[PDB]
Amino acid sequence: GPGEIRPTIGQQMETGDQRFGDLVFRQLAPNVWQHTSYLDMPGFGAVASNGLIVRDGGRVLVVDTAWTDDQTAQILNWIKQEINLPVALAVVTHAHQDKMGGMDALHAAGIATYANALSNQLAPQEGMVAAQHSLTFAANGWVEPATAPNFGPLKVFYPGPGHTSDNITVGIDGTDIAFGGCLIKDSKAKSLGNLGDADTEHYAASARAFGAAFPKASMIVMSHSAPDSRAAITHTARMADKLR
Amino acid sequence: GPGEIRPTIGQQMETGDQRFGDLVFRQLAPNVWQHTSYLDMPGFGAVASNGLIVRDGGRVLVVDTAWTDDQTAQILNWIKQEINLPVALAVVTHAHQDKMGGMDALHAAGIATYANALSNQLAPQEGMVAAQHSLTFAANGWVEPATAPNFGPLKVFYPGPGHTSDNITVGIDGTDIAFGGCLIKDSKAKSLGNLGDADTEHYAASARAFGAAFPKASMIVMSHSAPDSRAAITHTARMADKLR
Ligand SMILES: CC1(C)S[C@H]([C@H](NC(=O)[C@H](N)c2ccccc2)C(=O)O)N[C@H]1C(=O)O
Numbered sequence: 361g362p363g364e365i366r367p368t369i370g371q372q373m374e375t376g377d378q379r380f381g382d383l384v385f386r387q388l389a390p391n392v393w394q395h396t397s398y399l400d401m402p403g404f405g406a407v408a409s410n411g412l413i414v415r416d417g418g419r420v421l422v423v424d425t426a427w428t429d430d431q432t433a434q435i436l437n438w439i440k441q442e443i444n445l446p447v448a449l450a451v452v453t454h455a456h457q458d459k460m461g462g463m464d465a466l467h468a469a470g471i472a473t474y475a476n477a478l479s480n481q482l483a484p485q486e487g488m489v490a491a492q493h494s495l496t497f498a499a500n501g502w503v504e505p506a507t508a509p510n511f512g513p514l515k516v517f518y519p520g521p522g523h524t525s526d527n528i529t530v531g532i533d534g535t536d537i538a539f540g541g542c543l544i545k546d547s548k549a550k551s552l553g554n555l556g557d558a559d560t561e562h563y564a565a566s567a568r569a570f571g572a573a574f575p576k577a578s579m580i581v582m583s584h585s586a587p588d589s590r591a592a593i594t595h596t597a598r599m600a601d602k603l604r
Numbered sequence: 605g606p607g608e609i610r611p612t613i614g615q616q617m618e619t620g621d622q623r624f625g626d627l628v629f630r631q632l633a634p635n636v637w638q639h640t641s642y643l644d645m646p647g648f649g650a651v652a653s654n655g656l657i658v659r660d661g662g663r664v665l666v667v668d669t670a671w672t673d674d675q676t677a678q679i680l681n682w683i684k685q686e687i688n689l690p691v692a693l694a695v696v697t698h699a700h701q702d703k704m705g706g707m708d709a710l711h712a713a714g715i716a717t718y719a720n721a722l723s724n725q726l727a728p729q730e731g732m733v734a735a736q737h738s739l740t741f742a743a744n745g746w747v748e749p750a751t752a753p754n755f756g757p758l759k760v761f762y763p764g765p766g767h768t769s770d771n772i773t774v775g776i777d778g779t780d781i782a783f784g785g786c787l788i789k790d791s792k793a794k795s796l797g798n799l800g801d802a803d804t805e806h807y808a809a810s811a812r813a814f815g816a817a818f819p820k821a822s823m824i825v826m827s828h829s830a831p832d833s834r835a836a837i838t839h840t841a842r843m844a845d846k847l848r
Pocket residue numbers: 407455456457458459486487542552553554583584
């Protein structure tokens with residue numbers, strides 16, 4: 361492949377990843393893949409956003425869309441061509457473009473979409489389309505089971521306000537993988553990204569709440585970095601400690 | 605007859621009020637009273653915090669506690685001596701001291717307490733006792749009625765992040781009264797108060813959502829001001845418009 365996608369922020373390509381259209385796919389587990397799409401900024405470079413694809417028996421579950429509807433449609437085509445299994449549902453982590461930019465692609469494909477109820481409420485103001493179903497959460501952050509039917513190994517957890525007020529996280533039961541979304545940055549991150557809609561008071565405790573909810577997860581997946589160790593949880597929690 | 609209680613910030617005592625210990629109670633409707641507690645800090649002065657007391661049939665419903673357990677305990681003494689009806693439940697509008705400082709007094713009295721699930725999640729890190737039950741809200745902002753058992757005329761609505769990420773509002777059916785809490789300031793206020801836990805981006809949209817959820821409320825009740833007209837909603841929303 362003469363000429364590969366090398367973004368300015370986000371992980372770089374390496375053999376073991378599979379370039380598919382404008383996107384990059386990396387297998388993290390026998391049944392878990394990471395999908396990476398790129399937002400080409402006008403004179404700034406590609407901005408990578410990561411999600412996850414999970415095979416649960418005869419169906420496939422998706423975590424987070426791509427930046428655009430087109431890149432999200434390419435994800436579904438990669439699923440049909442490489443896994444050849446229907447997508448049962450998708451769950452998006454919060455109401456920003458890198459997570460809900462491709463809702464129209466999922467809804468055109470007939471896939472049931474789930475999000476935090478606050479995400480569906482904030483999606484109008486963020487220029488996003490809400491998900492079809494709303495997730496609600498208990499007082500300790502765990503999702504109400506009645507609102508997440510047939511989620512399989514997807515264990516959804518709301519850690520509290522951090523990167524946004526509505527950011528949620530997803531642990532993959534039966535694996536050692538947990539997804540932190542835009543709430544967690546890698547262990548060598550220089551900052552905590554876009555603090556525009558961030559909760560600077562509760563960010564630190566929300567990072568640890570995510571780590572305490574999945575204490576056995578050794579691989580942590582985030583939006584704009586290669587999968588890291590639990591030191592990613594630690595680094596951003598102490599980075600957010602400086603926001604006092 | 606000289607000498608009353610004089611808050612440093614908050615409404616004065618007007619004719620038609622009634623002092624009862626450290627509090628003052630003002631009747632707003634045949635079955636709706638407003639309670640006001642005072643937090644005095646050595647060297648700064650007293651700050652007033654307003655809540656609501658609703659008589660619905662043969663029971664009393666309380667909205668928000670006082671600053672302290674002791675002040676809250678005097679609220680139920682006022683209910684026992686001025687109404688003498690059982691206090692069915694209590695709903696608190698967000699996890700801050702002026703609205704949740706007296707949770708232990710209600711729990712010791714055998715009163716069922718209700719709060720936004722986010723308020724209960726944030727309660728330990730804000731120094732508050734979490735409520736006994738959690739309220740969840742749909743994407744449109746209205747409370748899921750399965751978690752608000754027998755609230756009577758109380759119409760709970762979550763307008764979105766504003767003063768805090770968890771502030772909720774309450775309307776009283778059969779009256780012209782809706783409670784904005786700390787989200788809405790009076791029509792001649794010069795600031796939005798404490799913005800440390802505030803969502804500067806969605807404050808304006810959350811204030812307007814509160815006004816649209818209770819379009820018949822001609823009398824708006826807030827935390828640190830005498831009740832005002834709907835002009836308080838517009839003045840709060842336009843003040844928050846400059847925050848973006
Ligand atoms: C990639 C970033 C460094 S900025 C970015 C992201 N931004 C977007 O997806 C779009 N800029 C956007 C445009 C309009 C509305 C919402 C998002 C977000 O705020 O999560 N997240 C950052 C992050 O995840 O830390």
